[PDB]
Every structure is written in structure tokens, then in C-alpha cells.
Design a protein around this ligand. Structure first.
Ligand SMILES: *[C@@H]1O[C@H](CO)[C@@H](O[C@@H]2O[C@H](CO)[C@@H](O[C@@H]3O[C@H](CO)[C@@H](O)[C@H](O)[C@@H]3O)[C@H](O)[C@H]2NC(C)=O)[C@H](O)[C@H]1NC(C)=O
Ligand SMILES: *[C@@H]1O[C@H](CO)[C@@H](O[C@@H]2O[C@H](CO)[C@@H](O[C@@H]3O[C@H](CO)[C@@H](O)[C@H](O)[C@@H]3O)[C@H](O)[C@H]2NC(C)=O)[C@H](O)[C@H]1NC(C)=O
Ligand SMILES: *[C@@H]1O[C@H](CO)[C@@H](O[C@@H]2O[C@H](CO)[C@@H](O[C@@H]3O[C@H](CO)[C@@H](O)[C@H](O)[C@@H]3O)[C@H](O)[C@H]2NC(C)=O)[C@H](O)[C@H]1NC(C)=O
Ligand SMILES: *[C@@H]1O[C@H](CO)[C@@H](O[C@@H]2O[C@H](CO)[C@@H](O[C@@H]3O[C@H](CO)[C@@H](O)[C@H](O)[C@@H]3O)[C@H](O)[C@H]2NC(C)=O)[C@H](O)[C@H]1NC(C)=O
Ligand SMILES: *[C@@H]1O[C@H](CO)[C@@H](O[C@@H]2O[C@H](CO)[C@@H](O[C@@H]3O[C@H](CO)[C@@H](O)[C@H](O)[C@@H]3O)[C@H](O)[C@H]2NC(C)=O)[C@H](O)[C@H]1NC(C)=O
Lengths: 346, 346, 346, 346, 346
């Protein structure tokens, strides 16, 4: 008969003595707020900034005995967010925020509904740009575990407790795709219970394994590196004599490997430790100098040589011939079987 | 006689028992909110970010029996947005927001007017920066269908229903032009009715086919690629002997194709799958190495050759002559008829 | 005697029945709001974004009979913007906003004063970043007409009318200078009266012819293009024989024209249609390949040639001599008289 | 005895008839607001945007007879900014704002204190990003005078007057250092009294001479330009004959001068008029083409030459020898004494 | 029995005469606010902008005798930030702000709790982007001391005093890692007590030594510089005669050192004084010109030389031989022992 907000106005109002400023079960057990998120959007992972943008549905669940209606014959009683500040709320935040906001588009995107026993369902939409450290040892082949963590600010452990729910504590959007990564489904859930001069505080937290898209930097960086190496070697399938063609076909290959290495570290954070993309290419550098080393190996022996003079020269021109046809691919094929296997097991 | 806002103040006020917190037809049928948009501005499609900026007029239409005036002799009774919060509103949002705002320029750009039976016309102006996935298989020749979707947050399906109206549910500005695309007029309208732990919620949604401007990357990337290919071949219309002109005219063409390929993938998202612009140019790469392959084919046979020695050499210098005048354009003209036809049918 | 705000408090207050929510002359003629702007700042025209930042003084003028004081012996009665929301205001906005704001620096920069008959002077300061389409056919020599337009949102035509005033409807700052353009003084003023499913709405609008600064891209792009063309031709004033100097002085000129063309389209929106800066330079490209075409024209005839063999060769070496000294400048001087005259009349 | 805010609450409250909406000395003399600023931070001068970020302490001083307490035995009575809106304030703004804000960090950074006679001390903290035109005729050697100006918005001249105070009207931070400039201590203070259709308004304004750091572009642009010029000339200290070393050492110098000129105008606004950095380098361009001009001067005379043929050739090879050893430095040393002296007197 | 906020409502309310506008111990001693921070996040040090982003927990501690409850049997009485504005707060700010904000994510991240004697614990979360000057004399090997400073705005020294606490006045996060630096644990704490026309104000301040990650620019800039120097010298281990290989292997090394120097100063602020990275590379420039100087030293003596003519030439070809094998590494090995030792002691 009576409208429920009118019933709610005398429920949580000054009548019935309800305060919005006091936690439920005060002078009693700590409040167990169980939670789960629905990731709407995810990504734009600025590895320069070492962070990621994510848009979630933060769902929060707890119970208030002060809000347990009895006579009203329904189960879930919703509330437009005008009266949302009139009730108690948790002091949730993120320990790795780096910028966030609500979404006031047409409405404060804020859900409330209350069970008969006062089980409080609370859902809001938050866009987060969460910082995460980026271990880039095997940089195109890393599985980044960028995390997120949810803590209480005023209420300590003894008055409030965050929880994950057991039934799928991270719901994921169906077409949630990543331009550069794959979100693995296994999402670790644990506690990061802090300690301060103030004291200790609750923390639930989530972990997100992100295996990359290997094929991109394969296309951009590996394959143009791959061409020059064979291009360095057909520059040994070049003519018998020390020609200016041997001069030109050598230096052309070297500058492109410098050029690809210039554009290699274009969007990278400036980590001290060596990553995987440069040792791919610095080896390709020291391979591409060997051809110019090989020409001077021809050129110094050509100047070393006139019967007996050139007799040693053309003999050494064959020891440089039949070995380099074998030694060039062998040092490169032994490189990849040395290279990829560590990056295949990690 | 009495001013209408004064009539409206006792209409929707505390007198006549009107609440802003309760949906119309409560404990009854779900509210059918029909809607249509007027796209003022559209574009700045950051394909790096895979999104698009759009400025709309979100028009919303429904009915409230609580707001049905009877005695007042007019039809549409407007309202400046001061009293807009005093009435019920829907909980509309976007499932792919990525940033939005209202427009408070001189006035909250918010329209209300009410029919005699309380049919509520509601219009606001929103700038959106809506995310959309970007399939870039045929990257200069794709028809991108970037979408947008409109959902309820608190009210489920059983209490609220979004609708498109039949009479032109997306109105488009007249001079709405795109710097890189064409908005096709056919705009698909359907439902994206979600399901959650909370439950199910209404969704109407719109789809926007965007065929590009083919001619730009034609000018920037195809035509400078086109010049080098013929420039590679007049470098076979070069002199009889293995000259340093054959050395210089070969390597000049190769580095520019590397240079255009460096500036090719300038503003591109890092997708794993191969797009169309690189297979345009990687083929142009492997074409441009064939000329340097052709010089060494001349150079190795020149070193292979003295009567019978040069007799085979000049004979092979003609088998490299009359075939390459035929084989060069034929492998390229067969490429484009292999290339464009798939990109002409999609 | 009594202070005027105290006189104003009983003027526009609840006493004397004044509403801020009702337009003047309600149930009567539409309100004629005449307006004019003072452009404080203007520019930073992001042609990539196809917009321009402008900071204006939006002056608005109309009349309210409800605000016509009688007994107070003065003419213009100002008001600090605290009481500005207490009166009626128009629902002005911009149809091409793309971001705007007010200016709360030390004070809401909001002017009100009221005549004896209630003629309302209303002035505020707005920074706008207004979108404008950019026709770039003659890109360094275009006169861009970037516009701005001012519409009503809730009030239709029959209740409200925007106007320009006759007496200089766009006031311009004195030292309002542009880094890349010239604002022509002639500013077209007309109507963009829209029509919707809602109905029709008033619009006044202004137009701004912007002729560029021609001399910049002259310096950056024309003059370095100009040097290579003569540098291509002194490479024909080179020695008699087909030298490696003819090889080196040719390819040096070609790569710089590629290099300038790489930096040519640095900050340009990706329009499909051809602009003027590339046809300046693509012609400079096909001129610079003619010198390498000319060397191979020497080189093929040098290999074509031994008495009668070289007799034709040196004769053709003179037909390539005396014609190219004439044919080189003539095709370029006929180009500019073909080029600039269309760009001098538009 | 009684707390002073309680004394202030009945001082400026509704009792004693104080209005915040009325200027002091109303229906009397115009209010003389004297002011001075303390520049906390200054710089990040985006010459592309032609503006500068500055963070100030805007101190404002005037007198209110309505706020002159009498009985309270102290001199300066401060006020936390909660009651700051309860009093009158000036309508100060900036005519060249381009974005600004207050600073609500832990507190509205807003100072009030009141003398016994009601002399009002008012100080706030503002970060400004102030636009300034950038005359770049002598671009590395200009003294930029970027200004700032402070005007009233509603109150005209006859009701309000801004002033500088005599005692150091611009206080400057001690370690206020600039990454690219030097703030000269002489700061011009004058009036920019505007005139409008509304009328005339007060303006005080400040001027800031900014002499650059000459040594940076000296290091980046002058010194690498300086090396090539001598590198062009040791390429004339090259061997007797027209060698391919003369070919290679010429073109190497030319492309670097193109390369430095490409990176020269990296961060520059696109002004039409010629600046100083390009005439530094375009002269360095036309110097570096003279060496390739000198080789062809050798090469054409080498092809011109066989007893009497080479006799003129080696004689002209000495007229090109002994003159160019003198003519090369002389045209460059006469250039700098032509160059720097205008840039030393301005 | 009675809830504590209800006890707090009559504690700090209008009853018991509590004002939020008056400092504690008014007309008495200055308030000693001791403080300490917990750095949550730190970094993204934009050396171009000369600043750093930091996210802190600003903890503030003082005492209010007005807030000393007596009868309530507990020690720390917390308060959700709704009633936070109802009490007195300090006027803290930062003198080097450059942008800051609070964090309203789900809750104003604002902590209050009050001891029995009214010792006020106050903690909030602030993200700061704090400016700091960047001395870049030894640019890859500098220890940057970027500071932060905390001042009062309205309250002077005689009414308010900031303090550090003795017990670890800067708490640091455990996994607080830097992408480019190391935060040294020693953090200097002192006073920056300002003086103005207003007067003098309290200041506590903190200092943060930041030693870089040396290994990055080692990898990016030192090692590619290191390769060319040996590559310059094997270009002297080249053949006996003045070959075009000596021409080509010289100029290839020079342009890469120009290319690395172009990408060297990519992200650097434009300081006038010379840094350490360029004197690393300008020496590498003047080393790499010596090889081309060495070829012309060969080439001029080759043209100087026919019995006695070449007899001096091959003798000078040995004085250029046996010295340069010794003189090349010696001038470079003496450089590094001159270089690094100053950068090892600072
Ligand atoms: C939130 O969840 C926590 C975790 O279960 C609850 O704390 C637990 O509360 C129960 C009953 O209140 C305690 O059980 C009792 O333990 C004593 C001693 O172990 C035993 O003698 C009794 O027979 C009884 O089983 C339990 O110890 C306690 N655990 C902890 C770690 O505190 C808490 O009550 C929940 N609060 C709310 C508001 O739901
Ligand atoms: C919003 O639109 C929906 C869709 O039409 C409306 O729901 C429909 O309401 C009508 C009448 O209220 C229902 O018709 C009735 O159906 C029963 C059983 O089918 C039949 O025996 C009756 O004779 C009568 O025709 C219809 O079933 C129902 N459809 C659905 C899917 O619920 C709704 O009433 C509209 N609400 C408002 C506020 O306009
Ligand atoms: C705002 O300006 C418009 C444009 O002038 C005003 O509308 C005009 O109002 C006048 C008098 O109210 C109308 O004149 C009358 O017209 C009738 C029929 O044409 C004629 O028989 C009468 O003798 C008289 O001249 C005029 O038609 C009308 N024009 C339009 C287009 O509506 C309007 O009144 C102004 N409103 C305010 C508040 O100033
Ligand atoms: C703010 O400063 C201005 C500038 O001094 C003040 O205006 C000046 O006010 C004085 C006295 O009120 C005027 O002096 C009188 O001038 C008349 C005619 O010149 C003379 O016959 C009298 O004997 C007396 O000296 C002075 O003219 C006037 N100047 C101007 C330019 O208006 C103003 O009063 C100050 N206002 C406040 C609130 O401090
Ligand atoms: C905040 O801390 C300051 C620093 O200690 C306190 O100021 C100090 O207050 C004490 C007692 O109020 C003063 O001691 C007295 O000094 C006089 C003269 O030196 C001496 O004759 C007395 O026997 C007594 O020892 C002390 O001088 C004073 N120091 C300064 C620099 O002012 C202040 O009281 C503290 N305020 C609060 C609210 O805690």
C-alpha cells in the first residue's frame, strides 16, 4: 500500500534511530564485506607508464541488522542513488589507484538493493588506471601479472573485513579482448593485509596473468632482422674478387640493422636490466659486422699478395670460401636453439 | 492564469504525493522508454586507442501517469533543468563509455517537456568517447562497424525496457563529415540484453558501418611504393656491363622501401594478425631485393668467365636479359590481380 | 537610501512573484535575445583535430518586463553572480562545442546589469575549442572559413529568438594575432535554424575567413625543394663522360626529395583528396628521377658503342647535351606558371 | 573573552546589515584595490603554444568601512575560507588566462585578514598558464617580454580601481630558476584600461623580460653546424686529382647539414617571418654546396683537357687551389662579423 | 550505551560551543602539528617537465582541548569524513604543487580519530606531481635530490607550527621501485620558514636522493658508441693501399655517430650548461673524424708521390702505420680514465 521509499524513509531515517555514520554490528564482530568485480573494459596498457586502464563493476555485499525490514512483503528493495549517502558504506579504495572516477552519465551509476534480513547489495561502476610493475626480462614473451588490491582506510581489521566470494569472484566480459595480450582465466586471490603506525587494515586483491601477442614484434622486429642475416650471406655468395659490390652489399645491411635497432626501443620504459628484444638484435648486429670483417679479411690478404705471392692468397681465399658457407648458418641456427628454448619454457 | 511552473510545483511536489525516486507504473508493467539520438559530431577515431569521439543528442521518451496534468489547456509543458531532478529519470548508461560528460555551457543542456497524458520527452547532450574493437585485416579497405550500447543499471528488465523508436531511431547531422571514413546510412538496431549475478537488464544498441577513405594511404603509401618498383626495373634497363651504376641504382631503391616501411606502421595498434598494408609493402620489399639479386647473378657469372669462358657468360647475360624484361612486370601485374580482388569483394 | 540589492531582493524575490524558471513575455511573443561577442583569444588551430581554440566575451541582451524597476533613480543596476541564478536566463549553447568551460578565476566571470525598463545586459567569458571542417585543396593557400553557431536547447523558435546586433556583432581584440593565419575582417552572419523531431530552434552564427601565412611552408618546404631542382641540373653541367660523379650527384638529390617529402606530411589530417603541397613535391620527385634517367640514357648509349660505334654515341651525347640545357628549366618554368595562377585567383 | 569569529559572525552577519553583494563605499568613490604577486613557480614555456605556466600568490588589498571593527583589541583578524564567501570580493580575472585553477590541497589556499579600520588583506594561490605572443626574429637571442594583465569584470572604472603597490609589486621566489631563460628583474607596471560596448574597466598589468639561455642551441645546433664547415674545407685539403674521395667527402657533409636542418625546426611555432636559426643554417647549406660546386669545377675542367689541353687544366687547377684556401674562411669569417653584431646589440 | 557519533554530535556541535573555524589553544601557544607521510607510489619523473608524480598518505597529528572527551570509555574514536568539515583543520599545502587532487574512490580517503585528551590523528591520501629542479651536470650519473615542502597558508608561525615526528617521519612502501632511479633511504628533514609582506610561515620539508639506473644509457648510448670506435680502428687494420674500402669504412662509422647523437638528446630538457652524455659522444665524434683525417693523410701523401717520389711516400705510410696502431687506443684509454673517475667520486 504505502510506497517503499516512504517505508524506507521511516526505516533508515531519524526515526528508528538509523545513522549513516556507524558501521553495522558496532561494538561487535568486524563487518565481512564480500565482493566481486565485473571487468567491463580492460587494457590500453601503457608500459611506458607501467599501468593499465580498466573499467569495472565493483559489487559489494554485506549485511546491516539496522536495515532489516520485516513487514514489507518483498525481497530486494532497490534505491536510486539520491538516498545512497543516507546509509552506511564501506571505506574501500585501491592501493595502486593512479587516477580513477565514477560515472555520472545520466545517473550516478550506483546500485543498491536490500534483502529482507538487510543483506546489502551494492554495485558501482569505476574506471581505474591501475599501476603495475612490469618485469620485462623476456619482453615479447613475458606473462605479465598486473594486480589490483582493495583496502579499507578508516576501519581497521577488527571492525571491517573484505572478502572475495567463492562463486566466481572476478566476472569477465565475454568479448573482452586485448590488442596486445591474453588475459588468462586463472586469477589469484589472496590478502595484502597492511600494517602501519595507524595499525593493520584489510585487503583482498586480484592478480591477472597477461601473456602477450607474440606475433606482432615477430612481424615488426624479428622478420626484418631475419632478412638482413640472409642478405648478409648472399653478400658472401657474391663474386670471386674483392669488388665494390662486396663493399656496397655489406654496408647496406649494417645500417638497416642500426635503423631497426633505432626503431626497436621506441616505446620502452628505461629499465636497467637487459630485455629480450635487444639481445635478439645486438646479436644480429654482431653478425652483420662479420661480413665487413670478412671483406677486410679478403682485402688484407689481397694486399698481402708475383707467383708465390698470390698462391697463398687464392688458397686463403678458399679457406675463407668453404668455411663461411658452412660457418654462417651454423652460428645462427645454433643461436635460435640457444635462444627460444628458455623463452619456450618460461 | 496561474503560471505553469507554479501549477507544476503543486503537480509534482510533496502535495499530490509525487516521488522522484519511484518509477512510473510501479508494481505493474515495465517502463518502455523509447529513444533516439541525433549525432551532432562524430569522429577523431583514435585507432591506436580503438575508440571514437561522438557528440549526441540523447532523446528519451516515456510516460508517467503521475505527471499527467488534466486541467491545463496546453500540450507540451517544458521545464528548465532546475526542476529536472525533482522528477523520476531512467538509469541509462553506456556499456562502452570510456569517458563522457554533460555540457553546462550557459545552461545544463537538458530538455524536458510533458504531454497532457504525461508522455515525457527528455533530451540531453552528451559527448562520448566510445570504445570499439577494430578488425584490421584489410586495413585501408575495411568497413569498421563501431557500435554503441545503452543499458539500465538499477532497474532490471521486469521494471524497465529500453526501445528504439521506429521513425528514424538515429538522426544524423547534415554536414556530418568524416576526415577518414564514410558513415553508411544503414544502422543496425538490436538488443544486447545482459545477464549477471544481479540479473538481466535491458539494452538497445546501434551499429555504425564506417568505410574508409581509400585514397589517402593510396597517396601516402601505395604510390611511393609504386615508384620504386619501376625504379627497380629501369635499373635493369641500365647498361650492358656490371657497372657501379648497377650497384648504386639498386641499393638506393632498397633503402627507400625500408624507409617507407618504417613510416608505414606509424600510427597503428599492435595487432598480432597481419594486416593489408604490410603485405602490400613486404612484397614490395622482396621485389626490391631481386634487383640486387640480379646484379649478383650478373656478378657471379662475370667472375665465372678467355674465349670459351666469356662465351657462356654473355649467353647467360642474354638469358638474364630477355627474361627479366618479361618476368619483372608479369610477377607484379599478377600480384595486383591477386591482391585487389579480395579487397574489392569484401 | 535603501541599498539596491536589498531593493533587488524584493524586486526579483518571492515577493513580486518573480520566477527564474519562466521566460519573459510568456504566453506572448518569442524573446528576442540579441548578442555579440568579443574575441579575447583565438587560435592554436589543430588542423589534425580540425578545430580552433577561442576565448570570447559572450554578451547577451534582452528585456524582462518582470525586472523593470520604476522608482530607483539609476539606469544600470549591476549584480554579482551570486544572484545570477535567481533570474531567468537563455538556454544558449554551441552546436560545434568540442569542449568548453567557464572561468571561475577569483570570481565567476559573469556580468549582469539591468536597465530601467528591464533591458538585461548579460556578459560571460567562455573558452571554446570549436570544431570546423578544413577544406585543404590548396593547403598552403587556402582561406579557411571556420564557423561558430549558437542555438537554443529547450526553447523553440516560437518562444525565443537569437539575434545579432547591427552595431558590430563581432568585436575583435586589437592585438589579436595569429601564428599561422590572418583573420579577415569580413564576418558573415546568418541563421542555421535547425529542425528536429522535437521541432525547430533558433540559430545565429558567425563565419571567420582565415587566410594563412604563406611564407612559412615557403621557407620550410618550397625553398629546400627549389634547391634540389637546380642541384639536379648542375649535375648535368657535370663533365663530358659518364662518371661516378654523375652517379653520386644524382642519387644525393633524389633521397633528399624523399626526405623532405617524408617530413612534408608531418602534421596533416588524412584527407583522401589530393592537396597542394604534395603535387608541389611529387612533381619535384619526378623531376629528380629524370637526372638518373638521364645518366642511364648516357650509360646505355655508352654501352651501345670502334670507329662508327662511338661516332653515333658522341652524336647522341650532343643531342642529350644541347636539349637538356634547354629542356630542364623550360619544363619547370612552365610548371610554376601552370601552378601558382590557380592559387593566385582563389 | 568572546571568540573573534563569534564576534565576526555578528560583525558581518545579517545583524549590522552587512551584505557580501555590495562593494564598499557604494554610491561614492571607486574602490582602490592595490595588489602584488609572489611568483612561486614559473616556466614550462611552450613556445609552440606561445604561453607559460606560472604559479602565483595573488595578494589583494583594499578597505571596507563596513568591516571596521572597533572594540576588539587586536589588529589583524584572520578567517578560514569557510566565511570567505560571506564578505564582498573583487571581480578580478586575467585577460590572457588560457586555463587556471585554485588549489584545494587540504584547504582552500585562501588568506583573509582584516585591520582595525577594515583594511582587507586577501591572498590566494593560483596556477596560471598565461598566453603571450612570441616575437622570434632573433630566435636564440631574443628577450621575450611575456606579460600578464588583471582586469575587473562587472565593476567598471567608476566603482573599482586596481592598483599596484609601490613597495615591490612583484615579489619573486629566491630559487626561481628557468630551464631556458633568465627573468630580468626589471618588471614594467602600467595600465591596459579597456573599452567596450559595456564600457571601460580597470587594468593593472605586469611585464616580464625573458632573455634566453644562448648556450643550449649553441651546443645543439651551432657547433654541429660549425664542424661541417671545416669538414667541407679539409675536403679541399684533399689530394691533387679529382678523386672519388672528393666525391665522398663532399656529399657526406651535405646530408648532415640537411639532417641538422631537419632536426633544427623540431619544436618551433610556424611563424611566417624568418627567424635567426635558419639563416644560420641556410647559409651553412649554401656553403656546403660550394664544395660539390668546387668538385664539378674541377671535373668540368678535367674533362675539358694532349700537351696544351692539360696545360690550361693544371693552371686552372692552381687558380682553384690558392684562391679557395683563402676564399673559404674569408667568406665565413666575414659572415659571423656580419651575423652576431646585430644579435649582440639587440 | 549512547552511540559515539551521537556523543560526538553533542561534543563538537553548537552545544559545548565548538567552532570549526578557530584553531585550538587560541590566544595562546602556536599549534604544533607533527606529521609524517607514507609514500604509496612514486615516480614517472618527467625530466622534461622537471617534476615527479608521488602518491602519499599525509598523516597529521595535533591536539585539541575542545575535542577532549572525558566520560567515554574508549581511546580512539574514528569519524567518517562527513563530519570532518565540522572540526578545525590545518591550512597545509605544498609550495611546489604543480597539480594535485584528493581521492574520492568509494569514499573520501580521509581518516580521523581522536584520543581521550583530544590528540587528533588525521590522515588523507594525496597524489602529487611535485616540481623539482634537475641539476644534470653528470646526467647519467647524477644523484637527484628532488624535494617537497609543506607550509601553512593563513596561520603564521605564532599561531601554528608544523613538525616532523622523530619516529620515522617518512614511511616508504616496501615494493616501492623506480624504473630509472634508486631512492636512497637517507631523507633530509629541515625547515624552509618563509617570509613575506604578509609575514612568516611554518615549513617542514623532505629531501629525496635519487641515484639513477646507470645501466640503461650504458646499453642505449655507451655501447653503440663503443662499437664504432673499434669499428673506426679496424678501418685502419684495412689494406695497404688507399682503397675505396678505406673511403667506405670511414664514412659509415661517422654517420652512425651522428645518428646516435641525433637520438641521444631525445628526451632532454634544454639546459644551457653541458651535461655528461654529449661530452661522451662529442669526443666519440672527434675520434670518428680522425679516420677520415687519416685517409686524407694517406691520400695527400699518395698524391705527393717515380723512384724517389714514392720512396718518401711509403716511408710516411709506415709512420702512419706503426703510430696509429699505438695512438688510437691510447688516446681513448686515457680518455676513460680521465672520464669516469670524476663520475665515480661524485
Ligand atoms: C565475519 O567473519 C569472521 C570470520 O569467521 C567472524 O569471526 C568469527 O566469529 C565466530 C562467531 O562470532 C567466532 O566463533 C567463536 O569462536 C570462539 C573462540 O574461537 C568459540 O569458542 C565459539 O564457540 C565460536 O565458535 C570465531 O572465532 C570468529 N573468528 C575470528 C577470526 O574472529 C565474524 O564474527 C564475522 N562477522 C560478521 C559481522 O559476520
Ligand atoms: C511495455 O511494452 C511491453 C511489450 O508490449 C508490455 O508488455 C505487454 O503488456 C500487455 C498488456 O499489458 C500484455 O498483453 C496481455 O498478455 C496476456 C498474456 O499474453 C493476454 O492474455 C492479455 O489478453 C493481454 O494481451 C503482453 O503480454 C505484455 N508482453 C510482455 C512481453 O510482457 C508492457 O505492458 C508495456 N509497459 C508499459 C508501461 O507501457
Ligand atoms: C521579437 O521580434 C519579432 C520580429 O519582429 C516580433 O514579432 C513581430 O511582432 C510584431 C508585433 O508584436 C508583429 O507585428 C504585427 O503583425 C500583424 C500581422 O503581420 C499586423 O497585422 C500588426 O499590425 C502588427 O504589425 C509581427 O508580425 C511579428 N513578426 C513575426 C515574424 O512574428 C516579436 O514580437 C518580438 N518579440 C519581443 C518579445 O520583442
Ligand atoms: C581611490 O583613489 C582615487 C585616486 O586618488 C580617489 O579619487 C580621488 O578622490 C579625491 C578625494 O575623494 C579627489 O580629491 C578632490 O578633488 C576635487 C576636484 O579635483 C578637489 O576640489 C577636492 O579638494 C579634492 O582634492 C580626487 O579628485 C579624486 N581623483 C579622481 C581621479 O577621481 C578615490 O577617492 C579613492 N577611493 C577610495 C575608496 O579610496
Ligand atoms: C609547541 O611547541 C613549542 C616549542 O616547544 C612550545 O613553545 C614553548 O612553550 C613552552 C611552554 O609553553 C615555553 O617554555 C617557557 O619558556 C619561558 C621562557 O623561555 C620560561 O621562563 C618558562 O619557564 C617555560 O619554560 C617555551 O619558551 C616555548 N618555546 C617557544 C620557542 O615558543 C609551544 O608551547 C607548543 N605549543 C603547543 C600548543 O603545544
Amino acid at each position: 500500500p504505502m510506497p517503499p521509499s516512504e517505508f524506507l524513509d521511516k526505516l533508515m531515517g531519524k526515526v528508528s534511530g538509523y545513522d549513516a555514520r556507524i558501521r553495522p554490528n558496532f561494538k561487535g564482530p568486524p563487518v565481512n564485506v564480500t565482493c566481486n568485480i565485473f571487468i567491463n573494459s580492460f587494457g590500453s596498457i601503457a608500459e611506458t607508464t607501467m599501468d593499465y586502464r580498466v573499467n569495472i563493476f565493483l559489487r559489494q555485499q554485506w549485511n546491516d541488522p539496522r536495515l532489516a525490514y520485516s513487514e514489507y512483503p518483498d525481497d530486494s528493495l532497490d534505491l536510486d542513488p539520491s538516498m545512497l549517502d543516507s546509509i552506511w558504506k564501506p571505506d574501500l579504495f585501491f592501493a595502486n589507484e593512479k587516477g580513477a572516477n565514477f560515472h555520472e552519465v545520466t545517473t550516478d551509476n550506483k546500485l543498491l538493493r536490500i534483502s529482507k534480513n538487510g543483506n546489502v547489495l551494492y554495485s558501482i561502476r569505476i574506471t581505474l588506471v591501475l599501476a603495475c610493475p612490469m618485469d620485462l626480462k623476456n619482453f615479447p614473451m613475458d606473462v605479465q601479472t598486473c594486480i589490483m588490491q582493495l583496502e579499507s582506510f578508516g576501519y581497521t581489521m577488527n571492525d571491517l573485513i573484505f572478502e572475495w566470494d567463492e562463486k566466481g569472484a572476478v566476472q569477465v566480459a565475454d568479448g573482452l579482448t586485448l590488442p596486445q595480450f591474453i588475459l588468462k582465466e586463472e586469477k589469484d586471490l589472496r590478502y595484502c593485509t597492511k600494517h602501519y603506525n595507524t595499525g593493520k587494515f584489510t585487503c583482498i586483491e586480484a592478480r591477472f596473468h597477461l601473456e602477450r601477442q607474440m606475433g606482432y614484434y615477430l612481424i615488426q622486429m624479428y622478420i626484418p632482422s631475419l632478412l638482413i642475416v640472409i642478405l648478409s650471406w648472399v653478400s658472401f655468395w657474391i663474386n670471386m674478387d674483392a669488388a665494390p659490390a662486396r663493399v656496397g652489399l655489406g654496408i647496406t645491411t649494417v645500417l638497416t640493422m642500426t635503423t631497426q635497432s633505432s626503431g626497436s626501443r621506441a616505446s620502452l620504459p628505461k629499465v636497467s636490466y637487459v630485455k629480450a628484444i635487444d639481445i635478439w638484435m645486438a646479436v644480429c648486429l654482431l653478425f652483420v659486422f662479420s661480413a665487413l670483417l670478412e671483406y677486410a679479411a679478403v682485402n688484407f690478404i689481397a694486399r698481402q699478395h708475383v707467383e708465390e705471392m698470390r698462391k697463398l692468397f687464392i688458397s686463403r681465399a678458399k679457406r675463407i670460401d668453404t668455411v663461411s658457407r658452412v660457418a654462417f648458418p651454423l652460428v645462427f641456427l645454433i643461436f635460435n636453439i640457444f635462444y627460444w628454448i628458455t623463452y619456450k619454457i618460461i
